[PDB]
Design an enzyme around this catalytic site. Structure first.
Site, PDB file in Angstrom:
ATOM      1  N   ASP A  45       2.070  12.926  -1.771  1.00  0.00           N
ATOM      2  CA  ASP A  45       1.388  12.173  -2.890  1.00  0.00           C
ATOM      3  C   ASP A  45      -0.120  12.431  -2.691  1.00  0.00           C
ATOM      4  OD1 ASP A  45       1.783   9.680  -4.826  1.00  0.00           O
ATOM      5  OD2 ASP A  45       0.207   9.119  -3.549  1.00  0.00           O
ATOM      6  N   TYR A  50      -8.643  10.879  -4.021  1.00  0.00           N
ATOM      7  CA  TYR A  50      -8.631  10.981  -2.904  1.00  0.00           C
ATOM      8  C   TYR A  50      -9.600  12.330  -2.330  1.00  0.00           C
ATOM      9  CZ  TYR A  50      -4.337   8.486  -3.649  1.00  0.00           C
ATOM     10  OH  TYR A  50      -3.487   7.456  -3.964  1.00  0.00           O
ATOM     11  N   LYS A  79      -2.522  12.446  -9.684  1.00  0.00           N
ATOM     12  CA  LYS A  79      -2.602  11.039 -10.296  1.00  0.00           C
ATOM     13  C   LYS A  79      -4.045  11.193 -11.278  1.00  0.00           C
ATOM     14  CE  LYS A  79      -0.910   8.227  -6.874  1.00  0.00           C
ATOM     15  NZ  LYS A  79      -1.219   9.109  -5.762  1.00  0.00           N
ATOM     16  N   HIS A 112      -2.841   6.433 -12.548  1.00  0.00           N
ATOM     17  CA  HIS A 112      -3.515   5.979 -11.267  1.00  0.00           C
ATOM     18  C   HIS A 112      -3.451   4.478 -11.696  1.00  0.00           C
ATOM     19  CE1 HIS A 112      -5.466   6.955  -7.281  1.00  0.00           C
ATOM     20  NE2 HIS A 112      -4.762   5.827  -7.093  1.00  0.00           N
TER      21      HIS A 112
HETATM   22  N1  LIG Z   1      -1.184   4.347  -6.579  1.00  0.00           N
HETATM   23  C1  LIG Z   1      -2.059   3.572  -5.744  1.00  0.00           C
HETATM   24  O1  LIG Z   1      -2.899   3.248  -6.358  1.00  0.00           O
HETATM   25  C2  LIG Z   1      -2.159   3.769  -4.485  1.00  0.00           C
HETATM   26  C3  LIG Z   1      -2.754   2.698  -3.653  1.00  0.00           C
HETATM   27  C4  LIG Z   1      -2.761   2.747  -2.022  1.00  0.00           C
HETATM   28  C5  LIG Z   1      -2.013   3.974  -1.700  1.00  0.00           C
HETATM   29  N2  LIG Z   1      -1.241   4.893  -2.292  1.00  0.00           N
HETATM   30  C6  LIG Z   1      -0.528   6.072  -1.625  1.00  0.00           C
HETATM   31  O2  LIG Z   1       0.428   5.464  -0.683  1.00  0.00           O
HETATM   32  C7  LIG Z   1      -0.034   6.122   0.495  1.00  0.00           C
HETATM   33  C8  LIG Z   1       0.195   5.207   1.702  1.00  0.00           C
HETATM   34  O3  LIG Z   1      -0.133   4.087   1.378  1.00  0.00           O
HETATM   35  P1  LIG Z   1      -1.518   3.599   2.576  1.00  0.00           P
HETATM   36  O4  LIG Z   1      -2.302   4.546   2.625  1.00  0.00           O
HETATM   37  O5  LIG Z   1      -1.915   2.187   2.190  1.00  0.00           O
HETATM   38  O6  LIG Z   1      -0.829   3.567   4.086  1.00  0.00           O
HETATM   39  P2  LIG Z   1       0.729   2.978   4.848  1.00  0.00           P
HETATM   40  O7  LIG Z   1       1.595   4.145   4.242  1.00  0.00           O
HETATM   41  O8  LIG Z   1       0.622   1.645   4.250  1.00  0.00           O
HETATM   42  O9  LIG Z   1       0.430   3.205   5.931  1.00  0.00           O
HETATM   43  C9  LIG Z   1      -0.461   2.620   6.590  1.00  0.00           C
HETATM   44  C10 LIG Z   1      -0.904   2.642   8.085  1.00  0.00           C
HETATM   45  O10 LIG Z   1       0.186   2.777   8.987  1.00  0.00           O
HETATM   46  C11 LIG Z   1      -0.141   3.589   9.843  1.00  0.00           C
HETATM   47  N3  LIG Z   1       1.515   4.065  10.295  1.00  0.00           N
HETATM   48  C12 LIG Z   1       1.950   5.278   9.917  1.00  0.00           C
HETATM   49  N4  LIG Z   1       3.222   5.494  10.376  1.00  0.00           N
HETATM   50  C13 LIG Z   1       3.147   4.414  11.348  1.00  0.00           C
HETATM   51  C14 LIG Z   1       4.068   4.354  12.467  1.00  0.00           C
HETATM   52  N5  LIG Z   1       5.096   5.188  12.639  1.00  0.00           N
HETATM   53  N6  LIG Z   1       3.868   3.401  13.631  1.00  0.00           N
HETATM   54  C15 LIG Z   1       2.801   2.709  13.485  1.00  0.00           C
HETATM   55  N7  LIG Z   1       1.903   2.698  12.230  1.00  0.00           N
HETATM   56  C16 LIG Z   1       1.947   3.688  11.697  1.00  0.00           C
HETATM   57  C17 LIG Z   1      -1.177   4.720   9.446  1.00  0.00           C
HETATM   58  O11 LIG Z   1      -1.945   4.631  10.501  1.00  0.00           O
HETATM   59  P3  LIG Z   1      -2.362   6.357  11.336  1.00  0.00           P
HETATM   60  O12 LIG Z   1      -2.685   7.441  10.090  1.00  0.00           O
HETATM   61  O13 LIG Z   1      -3.253   6.180  12.593  1.00  0.00           O
HETATM   62  O14 LIG Z   1      -0.784   6.701  11.714  1.00  0.00           O
HETATM   63  C18 LIG Z   1      -1.560   4.285   8.287  1.00  0.00           C
HETATM   64  O15 LIG Z   1      -3.027   4.274   8.262  1.00  0.00           O
HETATM   65  C19 LIG Z   1      -1.410   6.312   0.478  1.00  0.00           C
HETATM   66  O16 LIG Z   1      -1.831   7.359   1.484  1.00  0.00           O
HETATM   67  C20 LIG Z   1      -1.578   6.960  -1.047  1.00  0.00           C
HETATM   68  O17 LIG Z   1      -0.830   8.150  -0.996  1.00  0.00           O
HETATM   69  C21 LIG Z   1      -1.343   4.931  -3.795  1.00  0.00           C
HETATM   70  C1  LIG Z   2      -3.748  -1.758  -0.556  1.00  0.00           C
HETATM   71  O1  LIG Z   2      -4.566  -0.859  -0.828  1.00  0.00           O
HETATM   72  C2  LIG Z   2      -4.644  -0.358  -2.119  1.00  0.00           C
HETATM   73  C3  LIG Z   2      -4.549  -1.215  -3.183  1.00  0.00           C
HETATM   74  C4  LIG Z   2      -4.751  -1.005  -4.696  1.00  0.00           C
HETATM   75  C5  LIG Z   2      -5.497   0.145  -4.786  1.00  0.00           C
HETATM   76  C6  LIG Z   2      -5.921   1.114  -3.624  1.00  0.00           C
HETATM   77  C7  LIG Z   2      -5.427   0.795  -2.400  1.00  0.00           C
HETATM   78  C8  LIG Z   2      -6.287   2.270  -4.120  1.00  0.00           C
HETATM   79  C9  LIG Z   2      -6.806   3.561  -3.594  1.00  0.00           C
HETATM   80  C10 LIG Z   2      -6.146   4.274  -2.707  1.00  0.00           C
HETATM   81  N1  LIG Z   2      -5.812   4.143  -1.436  1.00  0.00           N
HETATM   82  O2  LIG Z   2      -5.045   4.949  -0.896  1.00  0.00           O
HETATM   83  N2  LIG Z   2      -4.324   5.435  -2.062  1.00  0.00           N
HETATM   84  C11 LIG Z   2      -4.736   5.130  -3.187  1.00  0.00           C
HETATM   85  O3  LIG Z   2      -4.760   5.504  -4.367  1.00  0.00           O
HETATM   86  C12 LIG Z   2      -6.324   2.008  -5.593  1.00  0.00           C
HETATM   87  C13 LIG Z   2      -7.039   3.079  -6.659  1.00  0.00           C
HETATM   88  N3  LIG Z   2      -5.787   0.719  -5.896  1.00  0.00           N
HETATM   89  C14 LIG Z   2      -5.554   0.425  -7.432  1.00  0.00           C
HETATM   90  O4  LIG Z   2      -6.159   1.107  -8.274  1.00  0.00           O
HETATM   91  C15 LIG Z   2      -5.165  -1.159  -7.782  1.00  0.00           C
HETATM   92  C16 LIG Z   2      -4.435  -1.517  -8.756  1.00  0.00           C
HETATM   93  C17 LIG Z   2      -4.204  -2.413  -8.884  1.00  0.00           C
HETATM   94  C18 LIG Z   2      -5.295  -3.742  -8.276  1.00  0.00           C
HETATM   95 CL1  LIG Z   2      -5.281  -5.286  -8.791  1.00  0.00          CL
HETATM   96  C19 LIG Z   2      -6.188  -3.218  -7.335  1.00  0.00           C
HETATM   97  C20 LIG Z   2      -6.305  -1.744  -7.251  1.00  0.00           C
END
Ligand SMILES: NC(=O)c1ccc[n+]([C@@H]2O[C@H](COP(=O)([O-])OP(=O)(O)OC[C@H]3O[C@@H](n4cnc5c(N)ncnc54)[C@H](OP(=O)(O)O)[C@@H]3O)[C@@H](O)[C@H]2O)c1
Ligand SMILES: COc1ccc2c(c1)c(Cc1no[nH]c1=O)c(C)n2C(=O)c1ccc(Cl)cc1
Length: 318
Positions: A45, A50, A79, A112
């Site tokens: 992803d 990013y 995205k 996104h």
């Molecule tokens: N669409 C969006 O708006 C949006 C928003 C947020 C995130 N995302 C996507 O979702 C992905 C993940 O969400 P996130 O980035 O918030 O992180 P997450 O998957 O919630 O993981 C958060 C933390 O957990 C730790 N972790 C991972 N595996 C672990 C394990 N087995 N035991 C303990 N700790 C562990 C990692 O630290 P270490 O790296 O030190 O392991 C990471 O920093 C992002 O990278 C991105 O691709 C999308």
């Molecule tokens: C929990 O962390 C979050 C939460 C939301 C997030 C993000 C990380 C990220 C950035 C990012 N970090 O990692 N991957 C990602 O795409 C965006 C671009 N977000 C949103 O656009 C979003 C949608 C609705 C609202 Cl209200 C606020 C924000």
């Protein structure tokens, strides 16, 4: 280990999250994406936001070249950033992601966020008083441009991220719709489990994809440090001890058993390999109800500066 999408393509149910804050050198994204593929991750992803698609694409290229995977074994997500919602900007943004990653197509292209921003290559447009500049875009016209990207072969599947039910319905009810979103990628973890939204998505054959499923990276630009640490939750930790797993594995397995595709970011070799063990154990039906009880309506991102956005997703019940 895949779910069939409503357009016939298949999505691996465990995905590798690639976001890392700007302080992390970009070489890390290259290194850890290779480690993730080596560990067994096949769903990756990423996003224009990013600043790592070049390194993630290089990692994929390297693992294809050494014979570990073929391109068709990898499910790559990008995205569309919110400054590119205007329909004429959609295909160029995707083509730019494809050029950076040196891929012929993405498996999945998402909007996104519904929260449109001032058009431009500048990712954080701000006014003379430092305030983010919103834009007003009919997201149905953005969706029509996404549909053309799928027909053009540049995206195998298209979906959305951070939409609520009303925003999903705007797309689903669009006259002349050709492709439903295959998924809605949203924040989803035991403290914010999105059960109502998940039920709606299931009823429309839309996959819910969970991000911050391990409780987010707790970036101090964005995350209130007084928010509870998900992986320290006493219920998750008791279940980890009972199953001889880890709280992270409990949180990931929770999503898999409720029909949610789950992402997991780790830039740590051993945690990367640990997370693929989610397939090796099962939670009981009673375990699942116990985790269901943890919901706190907790959004890890401080969204006050966006609460006034017309498309702010969290004003509705779901
Ligand atoms: N669409 C969006 O708006 C949006 C928003 C947020 C995130 N995302 C996507 O979702 C992905 C993940 O969400 P996130 O980035 O918030 O992180 P997450 O998957 O919630 O993981 C958060 C933390 O957990 C730790 N972790 C991972 N595996 C672990 C394990 N087995 N035991 C303990 N700790 C562990 C990692 O630290 P270490 O790296 O030190 O392991 C990471 O920093 C992002 O990278 C991105 O691709 C999308
Ligand atoms: C929990 O962390 C979050 C939460 C939301 C997030 C993000 C990380 C990220 C950035 C990012 N970090 O990692 N991957 C990602 O795409 C965006 C671009 N977000 C949103 O656009 C979003 C949608 C609705 C609202 Cl209200 C606020 C924000």
């Amino acid at each position: 280990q895949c779910v069939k999408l409503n357009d016939g393509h298949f999505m691996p149910v465990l995905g590798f999250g690639t976001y890392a804050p700007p302080e992390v050198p970009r070489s890390k994204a290259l290194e850890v994406t290779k480690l993730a593929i080596e560990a067994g991750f096949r769903h990756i992803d990423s996003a224009h936001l990013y600043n790592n698609e070049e390194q993630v694409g290089l990692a994929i290229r390297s693992k294809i070249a050494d014979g570990s995977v073929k391109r068709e074994d990898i499910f790559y997500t990008s995205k569309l950033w919110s400054t590119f919602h205007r329909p004429e900007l959609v295909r160029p943004a995707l083509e730019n992601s494809l050029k950076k990653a040196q891929l012929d197509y993405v498996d999945l292209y998402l909007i996104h966020s519904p929260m449109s921003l001032k058009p431009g290559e500048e990712l954080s447009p701000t006014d003379e008083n430092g305030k983010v500049i919103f834009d007003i875009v009919d997201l149905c016209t953005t969706w029509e441009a996404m549909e053309k990207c799928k027909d053009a072969g540049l995206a195998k599947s298209i979906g959305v991220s951070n939409f609520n039910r009303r925003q999903l319905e705007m797309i689903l009810n669009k006259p002349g719709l050709k492709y439903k979103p295959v998924c809605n990628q949203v924040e989803c973890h035991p403290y914010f489990n999105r059960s109502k939204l998940l039920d709606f998505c299931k009823s429309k054959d839309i996959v819910l994809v969970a991000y911050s499923a391990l409780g987010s990276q707790r970036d101090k630009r964005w995350v209130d440090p007084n928010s509870p640490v998900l992986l320290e939750d006493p219920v998750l930790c008791a279940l980890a001890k009972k199953h001889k797993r880890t709280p992270a594995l409990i949180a990931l397995r929770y999503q898999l058993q409720r029909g949610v595709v789950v992402l997991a970011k780790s830039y740590n070799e051993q945690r990367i390999r640990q997370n693929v063990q989610v397939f090796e154990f099962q939670l009981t039906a009673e375990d699942m109800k116990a985790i269901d009880g943890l919901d706190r309506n907790l959004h890890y991102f401080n969204s006050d500066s966006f609460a006034s956005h017309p498309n702010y997703p969290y004003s509705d019940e779901y």
